[PDB]
Amino acid sequence: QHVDAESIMTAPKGKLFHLQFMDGLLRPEPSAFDPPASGEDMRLIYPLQPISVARSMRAIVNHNEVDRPRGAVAPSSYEMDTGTLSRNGDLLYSPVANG
Amino acid sequence: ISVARSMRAIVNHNEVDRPRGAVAPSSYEMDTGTLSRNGDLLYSPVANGQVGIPKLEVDHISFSNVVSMMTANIRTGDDMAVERVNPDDVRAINIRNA
Amino acid sequence: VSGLLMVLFKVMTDNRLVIVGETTTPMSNTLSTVVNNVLRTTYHNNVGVN
Amino acid sequence: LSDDFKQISDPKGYLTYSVKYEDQFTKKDKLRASEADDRIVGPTVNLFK
């Protein structure tokens, strides 16, 4: 989907835009023999706030075989905590420190 | 005559005794030690203090070895290509000076 | 003797360069322990014999 | 009886993982889990492949 500058500057207030944003972290390296780019890819639109609020994990691949890719995201520990029921039956995370 | 013979009589005498003349594989066939500091094959060190003997150095056959290898095909198909650009004027070319 | 020469020669000209073939990575529990001690994570599906 | 509830097996949640894949990445080695471990861990491994 594409958004020309005009439409961002003139769209009705209260309408909901649907922007797209590349996570280009999974772009593999270019060949050593790929022709040079004389030009320059450019970008205009950016968010004012974090956008990856729903994001649990990122870049499930190895950099090398053992290194983590920069910007890779592990799942939060809380997603796995499955603690207990409370004395009254509410869900609880496991105690952090033993006490 | 049995110079090539690694093993012999792979059967049990009784169930537990070895048949007379039965031949176990030499330990060296299984040693798969290491690469040397420079990459030559080496048997494992015998005693803990001594260095591992190069496999090529002795007359044993070792059927397990470390082999260095590329993880995937080197021919990726991204062959090098160049922009040749010819002289503008043949008469202007400077043959001179080496 | 000619055989030996042609063997020597054929070795002298072996320009083979190994690339990793298909390889399995057994879970440790799937293997008998004696095999698992020898195995090092992955191994070629065409294990030779030893 | 009044049908106060909605008895159901294998409940679905309010939240679920969604996942986008770049299909060009694939590990060369083929992991071989036991059939049981694949019965448990399978749908997870398949999704966060």
Partner: peptide
């Protein structure tokens, strides 16, 4: 039945390297 003998020898499989287009690491 007659007693018999038979041989074997380990097979070759040395194929030319496969040309994959997938890649393991970023």
């Amino acid at each position: 039945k007659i007693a018999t003998a038979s041989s074997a020898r380990q097979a070759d499989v040395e194929k030319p390297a496969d040309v994959t287009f997938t890649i393991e690491n970023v």
